[PDB]
């Protein structure tokens, strides 16, 4: 419905989110994912580290620059999951992946835009409580990502600015909701209540 959808990666499961994003892009919806460092993977940390090490073992024996390339940043781990669920060697697949952007943290311009979630991929709605899970920032750091602290510093700053914004809107929402309550018990308001408004 929106011409761009900005998904807050936080608290979502890599594969389930990947599967939904992949389908959305193939259907011609532009998507942006933010906070890829807060994304989860089911399974305890150690297991997921072991899986990443198995992946690091894979390389063209006669020349390691010929791939596979082992990207370490959270955003690129998510991009790998996605790229695998799209026919990325076709022109249609290349077009589909041009409709996607993934970021650690929430950079401009997306810091002042609404962020949605994807309930079919939320960890809190999907995992049985008690099952262990990995957070992707921790995983990324353990396999050589270098910017966990920078993103954390920048996110702390953004959240200070954001809390101030919210405090102001929450104040303006009182004035409105107050002025709407005095408008009740007018003829217009009673007429509207008949028609379901």
């Amino acid at each position: 419905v929106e011409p761009v959808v900005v998904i807050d990666g936080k608290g979502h499961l890599v594969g389930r989110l990947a599967s939904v994003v992949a389908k959305q892009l193939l259907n011609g919806q532009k998507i942006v994912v933010v906070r890829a460092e807060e994304l989860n993977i089911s399974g305890e940390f150690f297991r997921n580290k072991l899986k990443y090490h198995d992946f690091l073992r894979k390389a063209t024996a006669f020349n390691k620059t010929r791939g596979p390339f082992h990207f370490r940043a959270p955003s690129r781990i998510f991009y790998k999951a996605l790229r695998g669920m799209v026919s990325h060697k076709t022109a249609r697949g290349k077009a589909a992946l041009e409709r996607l952007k993934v970021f650690e943290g929430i950079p401009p311009p997306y810091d002042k835009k609404k962020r949605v979630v994807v309930p079919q991929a939320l960890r809190v709605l999907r995992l049985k409580p008690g099952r262990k899970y990995t957070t992707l920032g921790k995983l990324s750091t353990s396999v050589g990502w270098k910017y966990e602290d920078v993103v954390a510093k920048l996110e702390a700053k953004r959240k200070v600015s954001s809390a101030e914004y919210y405090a102001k809107k929450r104040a303006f929402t009182k004035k409105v909701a107050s002025a709407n309550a005095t408008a009740a018990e007018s003829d217009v308001a009673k007429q509207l209540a008949a028609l379901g408004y």
């Binding site: 006669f62 270098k146 510093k153």
Partner: protein, 386 residues
């Protein structure tokens, strides 16, 4: 089947590819960790390799068989005139790494530096920084705002310095320009320091001291296209070998059906960037000093320049650094000296060094005399003297 006898591989896969460095000036790829309690200071310096010579000193190493005995030691002399500061760069941390936010330049740049912005100086109209300098007109609020930017946003500050290559004996007139990181102080203190040194010189004695361990970053001497025997150190094949013997006999198994990146092959040798660590400073020489080759034990008034000049270099009329042993690069090559990235507390690192004698005979043959006077005494009068 398994190789019949084991041996270590030839050469180190951490220094690949063995290609020609991208510039003649090797990049400092890491600066020391900043302690912001300390006063503001350069973390590195630029110089030119003059040559090597020889030193005597007494060894202070308790437990050694050579404790309190004279050793002779090779040294390397780097010609280090003062660097001029001509700008600041502010870098900001990002999730994609450090990015330069803005540069500010000094109002007046010398032709030594201006030359670095041209490939054809003689034909040019010499317009570099002509519009920029006019930013300093009025109060120069344009500059003040750009400095304020750096102070507001930057996480690391580096000064742009240039060598005074005019002060060397080199034929080149175009100076080398490099960013050096300021350690010590707050970001505001760092950008102030830089502002109060625009157009001013910085002397090597400000940066380095006697006994300090330092790192030498330089492009190594070039040797052009080289065979596998000298480039990798592989074993020469037997004299009976048809089709040549300075080779590797087997460049791989049948599978993988590809030559592997780990096999020794012929190609460029030398002109590689290298960072050699832990060179102890044995002397910070003054240029003004007429006795900068003399010691407490050898009171002979003389400079470090050996009789004849340093071969392929010249005199040394400037401040210099004398470093134990050898460093990458050849005579005349730009070299970056850097402060140690760690705090070495070896007994080797902590030794206070005092030179008994510096050799100053000619390096253009089997020099027998330290000075012209020494020669004239031993020889006596010659026919040309009359």
């Amino acid at each position: 089947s398994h190789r019949k006898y084991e041996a270590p591989r030839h050469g180190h896969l951490g220094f690949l590819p063995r290609k020609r460095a991208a510039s003649i000036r090797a990049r400092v790829k890491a600066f020391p960790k900043d302690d912001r309690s300390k006063p503001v200071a350069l973390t590195s310096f630029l110089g030119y390799k003059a040559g090597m010579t020889t030193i005597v000193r007494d060894l202070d190493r308790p437990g050694s068989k050579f404790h309190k005995r004279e050793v002779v030691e090779a040294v390397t002399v780097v010609d280090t005139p003062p660097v001029v500061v001509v700008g600041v760069v502010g870098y900001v941390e990002t999730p994609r790494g450090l990015r330069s936010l803005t540069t500010v330049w000094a109002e007046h740049l010398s032709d030594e530096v201006k030359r670095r912005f041209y490939k054809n100086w003689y034909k040019s109209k010499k317009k570099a920084f002509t519009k920029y300098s006019a930013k300093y007109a009025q109060d120069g609020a344009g500059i003040e705002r750009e400095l304020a930017r750096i102070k507001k946003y930057a996480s690391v500050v580096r000064v742009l310095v240039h060598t005074q290559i005019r002060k060397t004996p080199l034929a080149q007139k175009k100076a080398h320009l490099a960013e050096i990181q300021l350690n010590g102080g707050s970001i505001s203190e760092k950008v102030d320091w830089a502002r109060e040194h625009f157009e001013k010189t910085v002397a090597v004695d400000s940066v380095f001291e006697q006994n300090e361990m330092i790192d030498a970053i330089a492009v190594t001497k070039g040797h052009g296209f080289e065979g596998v025997t000298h480039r990798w150190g592989t074993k020469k094949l037997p004299r009976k070998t048809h089709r040549g013997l300075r080779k590797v006999a087997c460049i791989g198994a049948w599978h993988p059906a590809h030559v592997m990146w780990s096999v020794a092959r012929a190609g460029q040798r030398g002109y590689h960037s290298r960072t050699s660590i832990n060179h102890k400073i044995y002397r910070v020489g003054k240029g003004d000093d007429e006795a900068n080759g003399a010691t407490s034990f050898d009171r002979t008034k003389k400079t470090i320049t050996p009789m004849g000049g340093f071969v392929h270099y010249g005199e040394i009329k400037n401040d210099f650094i004398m470093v134990k042993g050898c460093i990458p690069g050849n005579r005349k090559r730009i070299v970056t000296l850097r402060k140690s990235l760690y705090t070495n507390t070896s007994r080797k690192a902590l030794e206070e060094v005092s030179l008994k004698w510096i050799d100053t005979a000619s390096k253009f043959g089997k020099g027998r005399f330290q000075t012209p006077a020494e020669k004239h005494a031993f020889m006596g009068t010659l026919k040309k003297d009359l």
